[PDB]
């Protein structure tokens, strides 16, 4: 209603926010498949929050009842199995969407100036997401849950001096137990969700401060019409809202297909050994991380030394933080970067996929050799970026976006 909105606008900047962030907010008109994933990440975050709240209504964060409570959700709670599969598939889809989101950032140089803070907030979001997923995977209290948590927290025992004390303090016990379960449940259910929501708010605020990149890397703000609207810019609402609605429907089709027909996804979304209750005294023949942690695992497994392996795994994630300063390309989009940048992006994607693929299996000779090679290539994609972004010859960026 007009009168109601006039009353609200005098007392709340509802129309001002709507016209500043969604309507009258002009994003580049050449967004493609790769720009669906921010809104899909928001959708998956909302899905995780809702389904997690509902799982918490029935979950018991104790080592004696966590697994039994999960089965109670799966069997006794009306549609509880649906909610649980939504949550597990949503964690896996969160990581799928976020990895494609980050790879969009890599493809189009969207981390470069002025979006360095956008990229840093996104990386903080990624760190929070990794912590959240790791702490959630302990909650089912299956064999994989318990033993993956055991190994991941023993990593903190690799710190030369305070490692063992720090690991014990994190666990809350002399081993992984119900104390660790309840602690990780509290962190996973409130603390990290709050941190993630705040980080997403900061991320979107920074983006809207500096504006979106586009596949061509063209700074659309340079060319504006007589009204001040960029020539290659269109209002986010309604055009990209409807585009994102279509993308959300497609994502939901895939998501529900997985939920209702292949919730385990061949044992990757729900690992088979995790359907066995945690046993402190019998460890699985081969313990592997959830797929979305597998690449870094491979890196850690590629280093013969334990402390250096932990350091390399940490740096594998930390180097993405400094990525905005490693890229010295005069252009943003890979479309106009030199052959070296395209080759190294291909190498990085292939190495990441291979590291994930070989970190999901028991060690093998070829697996170990390729994991070490891919660790080298993964770190070289970043370490050599400041050089091969300068050696290459870049194409001239068009004044107007293509399409």
């Amino acid at each position: 209603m007009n009168k109601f909105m006039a009353w609200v606008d005098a007392r709340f900047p509802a129309t001002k926010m709507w016209e500043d962030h969604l309507s009258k907010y002009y994003a580049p008109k050449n967004f493609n498949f790769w720009y669906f994933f921010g809104s899909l990440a928001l959708l998956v975050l909302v899905n995780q929050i809702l389904t997690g709240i509902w799982l918490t209504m029935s979950f018991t964060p104790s080592a004696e009842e966590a697994f039994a409570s999960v089965e109670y959700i799966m069997r006794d709670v009306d549609y509880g199995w649906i909610i649980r599969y939504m949550h597990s598939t949503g964690a896996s889809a969160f990581f799928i969407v976020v990895y494609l989101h980050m790879f969009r950032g890599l493809l189009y140089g969207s981390y470069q100036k002025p979006r360095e803070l956008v990229w840093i907030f996104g990386m903080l979001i990624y760190l929070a997401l990794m912590a959240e997923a790791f702490m959630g995977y302990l909650l089912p209290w299956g064999q994989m849950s318990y033993w993956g948590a055991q190994v991941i927290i023993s990593l903190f025992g690799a710190i030369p001096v305070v490692g063992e004390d720090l690991a014990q303090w994190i666990r809350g016990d002399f081993l992984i137990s119900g104390i660790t379960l309840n602690r990780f449940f509290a962190l996973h259910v409130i603390a990290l969700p709050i941190v993630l929501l705040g980080l997403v708010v900061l991320h979107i605020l920074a983006l809207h401060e500096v504006g979106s990149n586009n596949p061509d890397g063209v700074d659309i703000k340079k060319k504006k019409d007589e009204n001040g609207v960029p020539l290659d810019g269109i209002a986010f609402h309604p055009y990209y809202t409807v585009k994102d609605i279509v993308g959300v429907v497609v994502f939901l089709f895939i998501f529900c297909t997985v939920i209702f027909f292949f919730p385990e996804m061949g044992g990757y979304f729900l690992e088979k050994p995790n359907f066995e209750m945690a046993n402190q005294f019998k460890t699985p023949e081969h313990i592997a991380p959830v797929w979305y942690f597998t690449p870094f695992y491979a890196i850690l497994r590629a280093v013969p030394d334990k402390l250096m392996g932990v350091v390399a795994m940490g740096a594998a994630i930390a180097v993405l933080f400094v990525l905005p300063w490693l890229d010295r390309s005069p252009v943003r989009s890979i479309r106009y970067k030199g052959w070296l940048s395209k080759l190294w992006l291909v190498i990085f994607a292939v190495s990441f996929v291979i590291l994930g693929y070989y970190g999901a299996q028991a060690p093998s000779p070829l697996g170990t050799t390729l994991s070490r090679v891919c660790t080298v290539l993964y770190f070289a994609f970043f370490i050599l970026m400041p050089f091969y972004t300068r050696m290459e010859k870049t194409k001239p960026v068009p004044e107007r976006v293509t399409g």
Binding site: R75, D76, K243, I245, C256, I259, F260
Partner: protein, 232 residues
């Protein structure tokens, strides 16, 4: 090497036979404690009174979990390994693994319980289905001849062309109630019931997902039209 089994979760009779087998030959050591007798009866189509009379031996109520008197610690002490809860074993191991495991027990005097398993070597489980299968041993028997996948059947009778092999599971004749096919069907029904127990929402999941996917295709049509239009 596992043997494939085609498990029909819509077969109520097979699941009923599997539930009977589980309640008689398996619930002595194995619990199904994440699963209630009431839900098992409802999904298998067993009347509640019939479920009470025929499958509940522990004095539990219909709505009670399929708990057993054997404690995990006691059984771990007795057998050397705790008999795991079998509600989710179909998901943990898969149906093919279970089918091959329950048919791969063979006499092995070197072992604590006189038996070993091809699928699960040095397993701590006694061969509790020996009365049905009969004595199974690692001996010589006729096996279909295969040459680089060239599998020979009899063109006329349609039966395999076989040669002798001396590292095969052979059931000693006239040692068990059931022949090879009958024990195969018994194990198939048991594994079908275990597959149901691991994933009791499978059929409802498929139905609900079909309806969800139909709705999502409809909604996609409308959203795609609202997008392509409004992008002109």
């Amino acid at each position: 090497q596992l043997d494939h089994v085609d498990i029909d979760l819509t077969d109520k009779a097979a699941m009923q036979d599997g539930a009977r087998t589980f309640a008689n030959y398996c619930m002595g050591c194995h619990s199904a404690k994440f699963q209630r007798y009431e839900r098992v009866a409802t999904d298998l189509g067993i009347p509640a009174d019939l479920m009470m009379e025929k499958l509940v031996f522990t004095g539990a109520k219909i709505g009670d979990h399929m708990d057993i008197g054997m404690k995990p610690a006691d059984a771990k002490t007795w057998f050397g390994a705790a008999p795991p809860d079998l509600t989710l074993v179909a998901r943990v191991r898969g149906t093919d693994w279970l089918y091959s495991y329950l048919r791969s027990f063979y006499e092995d005097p070197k072992r604590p319980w006189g038996v070993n398993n091809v699928i699960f070597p040095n397993v701590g489980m006694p061969n509790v289905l020996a009365p049905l299968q009969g004595r199974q041993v690692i001996g010589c028997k006729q096996v279909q001849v295969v040459e680089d996948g060239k599998k020979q059947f009899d063109p006329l009778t349609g039966t395999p062309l076989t040669h002798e092999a001396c590292d095969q599971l052979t059931v000693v004749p006239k040692t068990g109630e059931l022949n090879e096919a009958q024990f195969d069907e018994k194990v198939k029904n048991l594994v079908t019931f275990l597959a149901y127990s691991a994933n009791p929402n499978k059929l409802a999941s498929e139905r609900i997902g079909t309806y969800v996917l139909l709705y999502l295709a409809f909604f996609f049509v409308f959203a795609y039209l609202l997008k392509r239009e409004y992008w002109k």
